[PDB]
């Protein structure tokens, strides 16, 4: 499923991302948009031979297992292609444990190098939310 911007935006503040550990709720939008285009359907080979899924581009080494990642922790306990589901409840579950491992959103590379520092408001302006 590709999620129109507001579409995710209202889903993402459903599952109670909106300032969830301080992050409002246009970091979320933005890191999505640039880590996954709002695709949940995205999938991207890292470097390491890991691989990043979903909305939210999570990584098979450390938060869920694909089965083919050497190191894999899966702190997530689920498997990587739950990951890909038009309903994003998994991913954010998920996400909700990354953005606590004490990098905050940093632990996004897009969302530090792309919209941290930027005005992250403007990619929910428009939204009924
Ligand atoms: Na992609
Ligand atoms: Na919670």
């Known amino acids: 499923?590709?999620?129109?911007?507001?579409?995710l935006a209202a889903a993402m503040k459903?599952?109670?991302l909106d300032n969830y550990r301080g992050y409002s709720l246009g970091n979320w939008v933005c890191a999505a948009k640039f880590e996954s285009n709002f695709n949940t359907q995205?999938?991207?080979?890292?470097?390491?031979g890991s691989t990043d899924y979903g909305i939210l581009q999570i990584?098979?080494?450390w938060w869920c297992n694909d089965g083919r990642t050497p190191g894999?922790?899966?702190?997530?306990?689920?498997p990587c292609?739950?990951?890909?589901?038009?309903?994003?409840?998994?991913?954010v579950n998920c996400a909700k444990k990354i953005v606590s491992d004490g990098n905050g959103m940093n632990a996004?590379?897009?969302w530090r190098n792309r919209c941290k520092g930027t005005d992250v408001q403007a990619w929910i302006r428009g939204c009924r939310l």
């Open 72 to 78: 894999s922790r899966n702190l997530c306990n689920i």
């Open 59 to 61: 990584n098979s080494r």
């Open 14 to 16: 459903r599952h109670g």
């Open 81 to 91: 292609s739950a990951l890909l589901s038009s309903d994003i409840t998994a991913s």
């Open 1 to 7: 499923k590709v999620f129109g911007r507001c579409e």
């Open 108 to 110: 996004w590379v897009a």
């Open 42 to 48: 995205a999938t991207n080979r890292n470097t390491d």
